[PDB]
User: Fold Envelope glycoprotein E2 from Bovine viral diarrhea virus 1.
Amino acid sequence: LDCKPEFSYAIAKDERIGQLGAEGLTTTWKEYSPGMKLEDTMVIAWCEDGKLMYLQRCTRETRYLAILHTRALPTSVVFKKLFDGRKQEDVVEMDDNFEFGLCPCDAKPIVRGKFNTTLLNGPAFQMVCPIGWTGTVSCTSFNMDTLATTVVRTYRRSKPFPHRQGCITQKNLGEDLHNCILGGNWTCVPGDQLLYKGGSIESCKWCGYQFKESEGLPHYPIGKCKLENETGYRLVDSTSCNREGVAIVPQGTLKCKIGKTTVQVIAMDTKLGPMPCRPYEIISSTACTFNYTKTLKNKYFEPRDSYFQQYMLKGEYQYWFDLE
Amino acid sequence: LDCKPEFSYAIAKDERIGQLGAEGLTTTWKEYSPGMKLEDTMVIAWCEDGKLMYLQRCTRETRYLAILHTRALPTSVVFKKLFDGRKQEDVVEMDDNFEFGLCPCDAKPIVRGKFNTTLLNGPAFQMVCPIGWTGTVSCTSFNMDTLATTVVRTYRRSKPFPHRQGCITQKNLGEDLHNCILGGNWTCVPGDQLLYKGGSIESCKWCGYQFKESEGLPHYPIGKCKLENETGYRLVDSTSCNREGVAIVPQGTLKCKIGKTTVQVIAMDTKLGPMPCRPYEIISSTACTFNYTKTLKNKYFEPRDSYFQQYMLKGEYQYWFDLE
Ligand SMILES: *[C@@H]1O[C@H](CO)[C@@H](O[C@@H]2O[C@H](CO)[C@@H](O)[C@H](O)[C@H]2NC(C)=O)[C@H](O)[C@H]1NC(C)=O
Ligand SMILES: *[C@@H]1O[C@H](CO)[C@@H](O[C@@H]2O[C@H](CO)[C@@H](O)[C@H](O)[C@H]2NC(C)=O)[C@H](O)[C@H]1NC(C)=O
Ligand SMILES: *[C@@H]1O[C@H](CO)[C@@H](O[C@@H]2O[C@H](CO)[C@@H](O)[C@H](O)[C@H]2NC(C)=O)[C@H](O)[C@H]1NC(C)=O
Ligand SMILES: *[C@@H]1O[C@H](CO)[C@@H](O[C@@H]2O[C@H](CO)[C@@H](O)[C@H](O)[C@H]2NC(C)=O)[C@H](O)[C@H]1NC(C)=O
Ligand SMILES: *[C@@H]1O[C@H](CO)[C@@H](O[C@@H]2O[C@H](CO)[C@@H](O)[C@H](O)[C@H]2NC(C)=O)[C@H](O)[C@H]1NC(C)=O
Ligand SMILES: *[C@@H]1O[C@H](CO)[C@@H](O[C@@H]2O[C@H](CO)[C@@H](O)[C@H](O)[C@H]2NC(C)=O)[C@H](O)[C@H]1NC(C)=O
Ligand SMILES: *[C@@H]1O[C@H](CO)[C@@H](O[C@@H]2O[C@H](CO)[C@@H](O)[C@H](O)[C@H]2NC(C)=O)[C@H](O)[C@H]1NC(C)=O
Ligand SMILES: *[C@@H]1O[C@H](CO)[C@@H](O[C@@H]2O[C@H](CO)[C@@H](O)[C@H](O)[C@H]2NC(C)=O)[C@H](O)[C@H]1NC(C)=O
Assistant:
């Protein structure tokens, strides 16, 4: 129903009309206002403009609204029931996208469940992205004198939630993007690393050396490589950090160049082998004239010398020759 | 009977006195000399005391002495029979030293034997180095009236002549020494070249090029090689004058060396190989400097470039490199 300009209103717990008037009032009478509001310990209620509304502020006892025309007789009071009255204890199965929770009887939540995924604002409470959640939250309360304590209402989740609104489901552990197995924003219980489905890429990391462009590598992209918009690295390819006896590493022993990047490399074997990377510092010194560079045991950089149609190789250095 | 002063004497074959003299006369009449001698092709006589004595120089024709008294009629001569005219024949086996032949009755020899080995000086003849000859010369004689013809004596050699101290048994052709199967000085009917059983060589000939010294060959000596007492070459070996895909000839196409000697040489193939023979002229041309020479497509002379531990080959030239 609604409220009307010329009536008195009050609330009541039972309709019992005693001799003198309404017997079971909880409140004092109240004459109309466009936005009048009425108040007790089991309910609040309100009129807009133009309409009767309420918000049960606990639910153990049953409450009816009393109404009595301002002039009319006390024993003439009329009751429409606003919420039913029952006790004790509950369960509320929380729907797949249940988010904002709200306990009743100024009662503090107790959280049993799989993981942490909660925001407690007093007896209010909230599931922040509990994707993959199970547990049961019981709004209990404790008596200080007697150390007994008891619950009003349980909210059950036997089946795990699925995904939802703005629930970020990918975290950085160090520099690597990692999945979120369960939960979303900050309840991320992280998983396996993210694999590269595709995308316009900015940067590749391999063997502990970070590259921009296709140039020099067995293929591009390779190693692990991160997107422009994003923060961390997605897996791609675990190509081994060795290129036929010559392995590329942090530490030593001579420096060549891939694409634009510096690189250190050490040789594992001493047989004839191709250096993977283009070389660093090419030093010259026509009669016969010759450029050369430093190398490893038996390892040849391209290009071959045209003149001797071959890679030309003392033992430490690889040479190139022009004869006039 | 006897020769007296008041007579003339001559000799006759037939006892015939025809009209105007004797007919059978093989002389001109000889006036008495104390020591007159009469001579013809059958017999020769002499008067020593006035008594007569003669020595037949052949048997076949029967002869007389003619005697005409220096006054007398020609038609009155007389004759004494000096000796009879038996026509018999003999046969003669020549000593192993047999050397010089002699037919009798002014009789042409005609010769049957193995080869050419005779000098013919009318009715006498000569065997020049008849080494290993066999045959029969026979001193035949014609008659133009009767067209029969006959021999007086056959000289036989059934068994072949051995060699005989004074006969040269090896002929020189080109610069090659050659045996005489049959003959000696200029009757040499030559044979195979001489095999070199041993002795000091002055010069070897291999592949059309003359070597003095053991240096730079499979061994020494080799090919064909001529001794210090001699004039031409005895065969020793015939090592193939093509060497590991590269062959050595008169004309073309570049000149390497062995011992002190020049050698022309052509390529048998292209697939890599070893020469063998040092090279002609090494042309030089400080930082790096480089000596080199010309060569054969993929063929290398010794020694390698030490500095690269390998053979050093652009395509027509072999190089050696100095970084000091
Ligand atoms: C469960 O999740 C939240 C994550 O945000 C944690 O909230 C913090 O709780 C600590 C209590 O130890 C408080 O001091 C902070 O006020 C909260 N911080 C933030 C950023 O929210 C909560 O503690 C987690 N539960 C744990 C770690 O047991
Ligand atoms: C998880 O985080 C994201 C990003 O911070 C949240 O999405 C933004 O939330 C703000 C509110 O502050 C709104 O303006 C938009 O909905 C988002 N921002 C923009 C620019 O679009 C998301 O709501 C978070 N989820 C939680 C906390 O559960
Ligand atoms: C950065 O960019 C990639 C590639 O565009 C983003 O991937 C998008 O996100 C959705 C799912 O969240 C994918 O299905 C689509 O492929 C992408 N959408 C569009 C419109 O391109 C990725 O999420 C971004 N990473 C961030 C913001 O960290
Ligand atoms: C050795 O280094 C020199 C530089 O001093 C190279 O010189 C190049 O040679 C060409 C002609 O052959 C010149 O026209 C260019 O100006 C030079 N190019 C560059 C990129 O500098 C020489 O070719 C080098 N030899 C090698 C790499 O074997
Ligand atoms: C023995 O004597 C004569 C004269 O020397 C040889 O006659 C030769 O025979 C050839 C036939 O091949 C004729 O053409 C010539 O009349 C002769 N030629 C030469 C080169 O002598 C006879 O053959 C001699 N016996 C030989 C050479 O073995
Ligand atoms: C071949 O010719 C030579 C000389 O022109 C002859 O020489 C004689 O023979 C011996 C060899 O036994 C040589 O030592 C001497 O030159 C000569 N010796 C004497 C003792 O005079 C050789 O006999 C000739 N043979 C012929 C033509 O048949
Ligand atoms: C040059 O010397 C050789 C080797 O010595 C001579 O061969 C000799 O001759 C006889 C046969 O005539 C061989 O059986 C012997 O081997 C050699 N005899 C001696 C004593 O060494 C060859 O005849 C000579 N060549 C000439 C003179 O032209
Ligand atoms: C290139 O030719 C010259 C000859 O002019 C060689 O130089 C000689 O070799 C030694 C040591 O190698 C040098 O010390 C001398 O100056 C030269 N000696 C004589 C006697 O000339 C050079 O070694 C040759 N390089 C080659 C063949 O690779």
Observations:
- Chain B has no helices and 31 strands.
- The interface with chain A takes residues 285, 287-290, 307-308, 312-314, 321 of chain B (CB under 8 Å).
- The pocket of ligand 4 is lined by residues A 284, 291, 320 (CB under 6 Å).
- The CA atoms of residues 168 and 184 of chain B lie 5 Å apart.
